[PDB]
Design an enzyme around this catalytic site. Structure first.
Site, PDB file in Angstrom:
ATOM      1  CG  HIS A  24      -1.712  -1.167   1.426  1.00 49.88           C
ATOM      2  ND1 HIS A  24      -2.741  -1.589   0.622  1.00 49.88           N
ATOM      3  CD2 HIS A  24      -1.675  -2.037   2.474  1.00 49.88           C
ATOM      4  CE1 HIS A  24      -3.299  -2.664   1.198  1.00 49.88           C
ATOM      5  NE2 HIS A  24      -2.685  -2.979   2.327  1.00 49.88           N
ATOM      6  CG  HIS A 107      -3.688   0.676  -4.149  1.00 52.01           C
ATOM      7  ND1 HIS A 107      -3.546   1.824  -3.399  1.00 52.01           N
ATOM      8  CD2 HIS A 107      -3.603  -0.346  -3.257  1.00 52.01           C
ATOM      9  CE1 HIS A 107      -3.395   1.455  -2.122  1.00 52.01           C
ATOM     10  NE2 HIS A 107      -3.421   0.144  -1.997  1.00 52.01           N
TER      11      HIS A 107
END
Lengths: 202, 202
Positions: A24, A107
């Protein structure tokens, strides 16, 4: 060669495009997602790790790994980078957008181990070979997927803006994720991918 | 400052000078051993991590660690580097010479977890503070030790010849050492060092 694309595939979520980044960290983007598909058992994702800066951090690192040096199980060919990845970033997790954040959605991240179960990452040098390791994946599923990966693969240049130290920093955090191996062993067993048919290190 | 010496101390062996290096990699020498002492319960070693190349790999890495960012327990001051070390290289192991090898003995290595039990590493910015964390260490023991560290501390230049990638390579191997946390939790309990009086992350 070893620094060539690495495709990763796996379930982002069970029922029981997007930049691919590392843990992340939005500066550690290592590639993009080539295809996605809600398979009957979950939402399968096949990604493409394409960042040469990343692949080189990894290639150099794998060369000092004992785990990586023992290689794969039996008839499989040694792939130092594909194995460093498999033993480092063994799980996937999907991040969506929030009203809270600074400015299937935001994402996909490569993690030590995913949070939702069955999110084991399977790396490979081939998209068919990777989709092929999953026994939940019907020939059909494999069609919708292939159709897509045939439009996403290997501009803004290299998306990777982290460095060697970032990765070394979170490798220590992983050492303190409890029940990591256990969760990972549950995952490969749930998803059906064996260390006898792939590079799974868990 | 943060890149200042870090002393590490601990038992190399229980009854129930030497270059300090990382995981026995002879190119990853990070300092030297300042003092050694067979205490009644074992052979206690106090080392000195002095390599600026190492401390800088570490300082930059710690800045990306979540574990390190949560800091110590309570009244203790945050020491990013002292904590990255404590959570990365949590055990000591002594290597002696062999007739087999290419050319208390050969060196002391910092490891994820030691092999012999009770070999927990305790890092600190002070040699007294470090020797002081061990309840097996009598005032006397602390005398023989201090007498020595007063002759070894902070030439051939920087002994560190590995790099960022080497460290990242073995951080992955550590992920596959079984019963790591368990062994480490047994060690701090055996040796008497608590996360309430030091930077022990295990």
């Amino acid at each position: 060669q070893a620094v060539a694309p690495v495709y990763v595939g796996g379930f982002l979520a069970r029922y029981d495009a997007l930049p691919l980044n590392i843990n992340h960290d939005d500066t550690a983007v290592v590639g993009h997602v080539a295809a996605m598909q809600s398979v009957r058992d979950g939402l399968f994702c096949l990604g493409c790790v394409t960042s040469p800066r990343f692949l080189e951090i990894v290639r150099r690192a794998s060369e000092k790994s004992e785990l990586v040096s023992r290689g794969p199980v039996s008839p499989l060919q040694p792939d130092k980078v594909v194995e460093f990845l498999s033993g480092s970033y063994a799980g996937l997790s999907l991040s969506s957008r929030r009203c809270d954040d600074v400015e299937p959605f935001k994402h996909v991240a490569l993690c030590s181990v995913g949070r939702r179960r069955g999110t084991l990452a399977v790396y490979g040098r081939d998209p068919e070979w990777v989709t092929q390791r999953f026994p939940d994946l019907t020939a059909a599923d494999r069609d919708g997927l292939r159709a897509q990966w045939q439009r996403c693969g290997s501009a803004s240049g290299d998306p990777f803006r982290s460095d060697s130290y970032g990765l070394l920093g979170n490798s220590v955090d992983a050492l303190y994720i409890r029940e990591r191996l256990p969760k990972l062993r549950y995952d490969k067993q749930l998803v059906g991918v064996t260390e006898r048919e792939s590079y799974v290190k868990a």
